[PDB]
């Protein structure tokens, strides 16, 4: 996509958890299932703004733990997040450092989702006891999501990725210039 990012309706991506998700990336928190996605995929860096994942929603499904590779199951639930969120390279090598000149993670992985713990996603998601999967996503509608969104935290706050096409496509659109 524009600035170099790699962004993709389906894929394979790595999962984890997070906590404290009330002031995200893109400058508007949301009330139900929410993620951050690694910068390749967010679509722009720290202190830029807002990038085209945001108000975007996934279908999130586990089907592998890589730290218990031996687990069979059960995984979780497919759930259905909205972007809120930037995975930043820095200070995230293992699952978020997918760049132009890697494109992959420690997992072998294009993409990652970080779903945040405040808002009940990660219980959906994550088996108790495994706080790390991989597996697949697939854009969606956001008819698919159960929400509200959060008030404006700065101008230029954007989830007007939650009634765009899934990608290609632009709705908040990329800022700078993808990680390398
Ligand atoms: C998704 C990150 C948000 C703060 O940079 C946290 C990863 O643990």
């Known amino acids: 996509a524009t600035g170099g990012y790699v962004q993709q309706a389906t894929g394979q991506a790595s999962f984890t958890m997070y906590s404290g998700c009330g002031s995200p990336a893109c400058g508007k928190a949301a009330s139900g ?10 679509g722009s860096a ?7 994942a945001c108000g975007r929603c996934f279908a999130l499904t586990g089907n592998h733990d890589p730290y218990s590779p031996n687990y069979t199951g059960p ?10 969120d930037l995975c930043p390279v820095q200070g995230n090598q293992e699952f978020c450092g997918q760049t132009t000149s890697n494109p992959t993670n420690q997992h072998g992985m294009p993409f990652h989702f970080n779903i945040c713990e405040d808002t009940g996603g ?3 998601f994550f088996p108790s006891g495994h706080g790390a999967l991989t597996g697949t996503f697939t854009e969606v509608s956001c008819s698919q999501w159960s929400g509200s969104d959060g008030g404006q935290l700065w101008n230029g706050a954007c989830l007007s990725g939650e009634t765009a096409p899934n990608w290609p496509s632009t709705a908040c659109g990329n800022k700078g210039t993808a990680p390398s």
Do not use: E, R
């Open 46 to 52: 720290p202190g830029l703004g807002a990038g085209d």
């Open 75 to 84: 995984f979780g639930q497919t759930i259905v997040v909205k972007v809120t």
């Open 33 to 42: 299932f929410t993620a951050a996605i690694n910068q390749l995929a967010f």
């Open 122 to 124: 990660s219980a959906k």
